[PDB]
Design an enzyme around this catalytic site. Structure first.
Site, PDB file in Angstrom:
ATOM      1  N   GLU A 171      21.257   4.585  -2.695  1.00  0.00           N
ATOM      2  CA  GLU A 171      20.266   4.282  -1.458  1.00  0.00           C
ATOM      3  C   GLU A 171      21.058   4.679  -0.151  1.00  0.00           C
ATOM      4  OE1 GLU A 171      17.895   0.738  -1.362  1.00  0.00           O
ATOM      5  OE2 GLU A 171      19.069   0.216   0.679  1.00  0.00           O
ATOM      6  N   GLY A 177      12.845   2.195  -7.004  1.00  0.00           N
ATOM      7  CA  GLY A 177      12.556   1.324  -8.067  1.00  0.00           C
ATOM      8  C   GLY A 177      13.917   1.523  -8.954  1.00  0.00           C
ATOM      9  N   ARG A 185      26.613   0.647  -8.045  1.00  0.00           N
ATOM     10  CA  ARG A 185      26.937   1.717  -9.075  1.00  0.00           C
ATOM     11  C   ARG A 185      28.376   2.128  -8.861  1.00  0.00           C
ATOM     12  NH1 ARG A 185      22.779   2.279 -12.198  1.00  0.00           N
ATOM     13  NH2 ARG A 185      20.684   1.979 -11.559  1.00  0.00           N
ATOM     14  N   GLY A 199      17.540  -7.947  -9.269  1.00  0.00           N
ATOM     15  CA  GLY A 199      16.784  -8.703  -8.245  1.00  0.00           C
ATOM     16  C   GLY A 199      16.221 -10.017  -9.154  1.00  0.00           C
TER      17      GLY A 199
HETATM   18  O1  LIG Z   1      17.340  -3.940  -9.607  1.00  0.00           O
HETATM   19  C1  LIG Z   1      16.868  -3.747  -8.468  1.00  0.00           C
HETATM   20  O2  LIG Z   1      16.188  -4.385  -8.118  1.00  0.00           O
HETATM   21  C2  LIG Z   1      17.378  -2.447  -7.802  1.00  0.00           C
HETATM   22  C3  LIG Z   1      16.438  -1.931  -7.184  1.00  0.00           C
HETATM   23  C4  LIG Z   1      14.665  -2.041  -6.727  1.00  0.00           C
HETATM   24  C5  LIG Z   1      14.291  -1.369  -5.712  1.00  0.00           C
HETATM   25  C6  LIG Z   1      12.770  -1.556  -5.527  1.00  0.00           C
HETATM   26  C7  LIG Z   1      11.993  -2.143  -6.598  1.00  0.00           C
HETATM   27  C8  LIG Z   1      12.539  -2.660  -7.786  1.00  0.00           C
HETATM   28  C9  LIG Z   1      13.856  -2.564  -8.115  1.00  0.00           C
HETATM   29  O3  LIG Z   1      18.501  -2.158  -7.734  1.00  0.00           O
HETATM   30  C10 LIG Z   1      19.566  -3.027  -7.557  1.00  0.00           C
HETATM   31  C11 LIG Z   1      19.579  -4.003  -6.827  1.00  0.00           C
HETATM   32  C12 LIG Z   1      20.841  -5.005  -6.646  1.00  0.00           C
HETATM   33  C13 LIG Z   1      21.657  -4.695  -7.197  1.00  0.00           C
HETATM   34  C14 LIG Z   1      21.972  -3.385  -7.899  1.00  0.00           C
HETATM   35  C15 LIG Z   1      23.253  -2.828  -8.723  1.00  0.00           C
HETATM   36  O4  LIG Z   1      23.294  -1.726  -9.430  1.00  0.00           O
HETATM   37  O5  LIG Z   1      23.999  -3.713  -8.655  1.00  0.00           O
HETATM   38  C16 LIG Z   1      20.726  -2.511  -8.161  1.00  0.00           C
HETATM   39  O6  LIG Z   1      20.904  -1.238  -8.850  1.00  0.00           O
HETATM   40 MG   LIG Z   2      13.988  -6.307 -11.501  1.00  0.00          MG
END
Ligand SMILES: O=C(O)/C(=C\c1ccccc1)Oc1cccc(C(=O)O)c1O
Ligand SMILES: [Mg+2]
Ligand SMILES: O=C(O)/C(=C/c1ccccc1)Oc1cccc(C(=O)O)c1O
Ligand SMILES: O=C(O)/C(=C/c1ccccc1)Oc1cccc(C(=O)O)c1O
EC number: 5.4.99.5
Length: 417
Positions: free
Chosen positions: A238, A256, A372, A388
């Site tokens: 991101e 996502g 990551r 999340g």
């Molecule tokens: O895991 C979700 O929440 C996500 C994204 C997401 C974005 C929009 C909708 C749903 C999920 O990614 C992350 C959130 C927090 C930590 C991490 C992590 O790799 O340590 C992560 O990959």
């Molecule tokens: Mg989730």
């Protein structure tokens, strides 16, 4: 001679990472490699260093440290010191801690003394590697000979990776998730991102692991660094903030985990929607009236873009502050999500869910969300991954989710030789 044509077949990520290892094999200097829109910018050696801690600001130049107290907002103290580095240099690089984002949510008093907030340096040399070319900035014979040698002999073959067991849960992630689910059910907040550290029981070769992981991941941004006591690398999913010289500010929240099946996709759409809405509300703070908008919503490119025009009364560090810590990696409402992380996660987070940054003299800022990623701070090597947490979250399923997030790194760890 400051522009060497890139040989065909030579992958820019492999050449840039090998260059980082080679230019520093005898000259034990620090560096930061940042991949940004097909350009791998290697910032080599420290000309001047800005160290922002919770209780102190240090500027280190020519073996001399100047220390001072700072008041007000961290973005203002960081911005003032970085603008000064940039008076006589084109670019500055570094990292921003998750903790840099807490002051906005009234949690600065919860930081222990000496908590790092940011580390930004002006490099001695820059080498820019793309598919098109290799560009050299303030390079010496060392850098030029390193390029000729790698083009003549080729990059090292990447050794076989070494396996790691991520199944362990010594920080009580499952237990912490259960507490968050209870607070959500009690109406304290709607979402919180909780994480866990995974200790790597062997020292890794950061440039080789970077190269290997980069072959099996295509991120929005990537990085490889050694700076102060820290080594790190990551495949950032991101772009938390980009500021152009013309005042255009963007943020691109993660769409996502793919960016029964309907129910899971519905959950991700809801989460993403909420993140985009949060990004829009926060960006409005630094935006010229009527300039904040969602220009791309869930488009295939899968992602979303929130843009704005930087208000003349605002700046790049205030823009970063407005959007920090990333909503993707904190929670909803943001203030309650951030406070729950102080209680329910291993703190300070430091680089994890912070940013890796590239700043330009023209006002430019490019900030990648640190997820990551692998880290090494004296003797300790670790990975970190989160999820999340929502009212419906199940601790076992969320622990499995962190395992899936870790699987983008775990197969590609190259042990030190
Ligand atoms: O895991 C979700 O929440 C996500 C994204 C997401 C974005 C929009 C909708 C749903 C999920 O990614 C992350 C959130 C927090 C930590 C991490 C992590 O790799 O340590 C992560 O990959
Ligand atoms: Mg989730
Ligand atoms: O990189 C220069 O510009 C350089 C200048 C210099 C060296 C010796 C004597 C006088 C000048 O020194 C070097 C040259 C080649 C390789 C290295 C190296 O560490 O791998 C190096 O440090
Ligand atoms: O507006 C909903 O009903 C909603 C649902 C939701 C939130 C997080 C995760 C999944 C769903 O979101 C929110 C509720 C309350 C406050 C906020 C907020 O930004 O201050 C928010 O975005």
């Amino acid at each position: 001679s400051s522009s060497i044509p890139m040989p065909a077949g030579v992958n820019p990520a492999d050449l840039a990472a090998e260059l980082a290892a080679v230019v520093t094999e005898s000259v034990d200097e620090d560096y930061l490699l940042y991949e940004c829109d097909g350009q791998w910018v290697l910032a080599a050696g420290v000309q001047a260093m800005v160290e922002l801690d919770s209780d102190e600001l240090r500027v280190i130049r020519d073996g001399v440290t100047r220390r001072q107290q700072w008041s007000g907002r961290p973005g203002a103290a960081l911005g003032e010191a970085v603008d000064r580095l940039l008076l006589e240099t084109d670019q500055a690089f570094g990292w921003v801690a998750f903790e840099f984002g807490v002051h906005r949510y009234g949690l600065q008093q919860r930081l222990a003394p000496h908590t790092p907030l940011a580390r930004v340096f002006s490099p001695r040399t820059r080498i820019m590697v793309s598919e098109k070319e290799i560009r050299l900035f303030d390079a010496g014979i060392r850098h030029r000979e390193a390029i000729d040698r790698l083009l003549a002999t080729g990059v090292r073959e990447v050794p076989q990776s070494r396996s790691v067991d991520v199944s362990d849960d010594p920080s009580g992630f499952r237990r912490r998730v259960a507490v968050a689910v209870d607070e959500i059910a009690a109406g304290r907040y709607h979402k919180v991102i909780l994480s866990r550290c995974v200790e790597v029981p062997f020292a890794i070769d950061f440039p080789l692991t970077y190269r290997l992981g980069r072959r099996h991941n295509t991120p929005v941004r990537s990085f490889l660094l050694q700076l102060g006591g820290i080594r790190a690398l990551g495949y950032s999913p991101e772009l938390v903030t980009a500021v152009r010289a013309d005042g255009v500010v963007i943020t691109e929240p993660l769409a996502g985990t793919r960016a029964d099946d309907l129910e899971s996709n519905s959950k991700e759409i809801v989460e993403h929607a909420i993140s985009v809405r949060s990004s829009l509300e926060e960006i409005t703070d630094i935006a010229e009236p009527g300039s904040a908008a969602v220009i791309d919503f869930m488009t295939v490119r899968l992602g979303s873009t929130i843009r704005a025009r930087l208000d003349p009364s605002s700046d790049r560090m205030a823009a970063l502050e407005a959007l920090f810590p990333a909503v993707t990696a904190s929670g909803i409402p943001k203030a309650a999500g951030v406070e729950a992380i102080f209680r329910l996660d291993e703190c300070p987070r430091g680089l994890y869910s912070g940013a890796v940054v590239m700043l330009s003299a023209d006002g430019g800022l490019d900030a990648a969300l640190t997820l990551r990623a692998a880290y090494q701070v004296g003797g300790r090597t670790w990975l970190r991954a989160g999820a999340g947490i929502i009212e419906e979250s199940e601790p076992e399923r969320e622990f499995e989710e962190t395992c899936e997030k870790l699987s983008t790194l775990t197969p590609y760890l190259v042990a030190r030789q």
